[PDB]
Each structure stands twice: as structure tokens, then as C-alpha cells.
Amino acid sequence: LECHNQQSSQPPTTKTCSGETNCYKKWWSDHRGTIIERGCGCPKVKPGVNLNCCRTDRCNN
């Protein structure tokens, strides 16, 4: 299973999930801009931050 590892508006990327079978996508706003952090797995984010987990390849794009 592949999950996007691209940050912010940066170039769309992907990475192989090891031991994981879900893709997560984190994104939030800041005084500097909207930060976006994606990767393999389904980690936990703090209050205010957005997170989306799915069981689809490059679903966390």
C-alpha cells in the first residue's frame, strides 16, 4: 500500500507503508500558511489539526 508523503502544496509524492495498511493526511492552518503532512499509517494529531485515514492506495493525497 502506498501513501502520499507530500507536504503542504509541495510536489505530490508517495511512500511504501511498512507494517501499515492505511494512509493518513494531516493539514492545518498557520500564520505562515497551511501546513500539510501526509504519510503511511494512521497516526494521531492534536486538536485543531486535521487528519484523514483511509485504506486506499494514494488515498491520502
CATH top-level class for 1-61?
A: mainly beta
- Residue 58 CA to residue 23 CA, distance in Å, equals 7
* Contact residues for 49 (Cβ-Cβ < 8 A; gap 6+): 26, 27, 28
7 neighbors 34 (Cβ within 8 angstroms) = no
3-state secondary structure of 5: coil
- Residue 8 CA to residue 23 CA, distance in Å, equals 16
End-to-end CA distance of the chain: 13
Q: Is the dihedral of CA 17, 55, 52, 6 positive or negative?
A: positive
Residue with cell 503532512: 37
Q: How was this structure determined?
A: NMR
| Residue boundaries of the structural domains of the chain | 1-61
58 neighbors 4 (Cβ within 8 angstroms) = yes
Q: What is the DSSP letter of 53?
A: E
- Please list every residue in the chain followed by a chain break, i.e. its C lies more than 2.5 Å from the next written N: none
Q: What pairs with residue 50 in β-bridges? A: 27
